[PDB]
Amino acid sequence: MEPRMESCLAQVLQKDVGKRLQVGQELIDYFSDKQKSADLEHDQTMLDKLVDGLATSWVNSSNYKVVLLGMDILSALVTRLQDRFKAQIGTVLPSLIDRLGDAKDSVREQDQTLLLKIMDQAANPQYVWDRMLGGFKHKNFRTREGICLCLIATLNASGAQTLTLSKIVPHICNLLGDPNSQVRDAAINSLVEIYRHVGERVRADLSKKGLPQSRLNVIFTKFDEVQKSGNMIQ
């Protein structure tokens, strides 16, 4: 193609899957080359349009290879733009949140990898998580599970100090009574991980939330197991 923003935008908007598979990597090279893409933030309007095209069209593609490649292009953008990507986070998040529950595990996993990278280079964990809480109520059980997993992954990447956990825990608690057993496991797991990073405070928070006692029993027993194993992180 051409090393120009209108050329790249056009290759992002065009909807031929074969051509997308062919130029995804060229788009990556363009954004990761400061000379070829020196004009990147000259026109904020078509920068916005390009991110938007990736999020709405590539990420939502029915071809999972297009989804993964689109996520990769986004990833190159984050590396190139750093904190200036913060302006784009809101635009990309709904489709990334959805794709935490995609049919393909490879997509769920790269999606998490990208999300973590956005938290690391475009903003911070809490700015992104303030905007992801909607995912807890997503109708696809694989997305609710994905949110809990992504929270675990976040604790390990950045530590509990970077999250306002008191904001997030109520949502997980809601997930404890999920119709889906995998979502319920994932939520219990999330609470166990939080406890590993934070300790007894979580047990107090949880006890004051009017959960059924059956639920409290399962979780607290698991907390006790963590203590027994000296598996605390902190």
Author numbering: 1 to 234
Paper text:
Two prime animal MAP families that bind tubulin and are recruited to microtubule plus ends by EB proteins (either directly or indirectly) are the Cytoplasmic Linker-Associated Protein (CLASP) family and the XMAP215 family of microtubule polymerases. While XMAP215 family members promote microtubule polymerization, CLASP family members promote microtubule pause, potentiate rescue, and limit catastrophe. While the CLASP and XMAP215 families differentially affect microtubule dynamics, they both employ an array of tubulin-binding TOG domains to regulate the microtubule polymer. While mammalian XMAP215 family members contain an N-terminal pentameric TOG domain array, mammalian CLASPs contains three TOG domains (TOG1-3) followed by a C-terminal CLIP-170 interaction domain (CLIP-ID).
To determine the structure of H.s. CLASP1 TOG1 we crystallized a selenomethionine-substituted construct embodying residues 1 to 257 and collected a 2.15 Å resolution single wavelength anomalous diffraction dataset. Crystals belong to the space group P21 and contain two protomers in the asymmetric unit. The structure was refined to R and Rfree values of 19.0% and 24.4% respectively. CLASP TOG1 is an α-solenoid structure approximately 65 Å in length, consisting of six HRs designated HR A through F. The second HR triad (HRs D-F) is translated relative to the axis of the first HR triad, introducing a jog in the α-solenoid that gives the domain a flat, paddle-like architecture, rather than an elongated spiral common to other α-solenoid structures. Interestingly, while XMAP215 family TOG domains are primarily conserved across the HR A-C intra-HEAT loops, animal CLASP family TOG1 conservation is primarily focused along the surface formed by the HR C-E intra-HR loops. CLASP1 TOG1 superimposes on the Stu2 TOG2-αβ-tubulin structure surprisingly well, with its intra-HEAT loops positioned to complement the surface of the tubulin heterodimer. CLASP1 TOG1 has distinct determinants across the intra-HR loops that likely explain why no tubulin or microtubule-binding activity has been detected for animal CLASP family TOG1 domains. Instead of binding tubulin, the animal CLASP family TOG1 domain’s conserved intra-HR loops may be involved in binding a kinetochore factor, relieving the auto-inhibition of the CLASP family TOG2 domain’s activity, binding actin, or a yet to be determined factor.
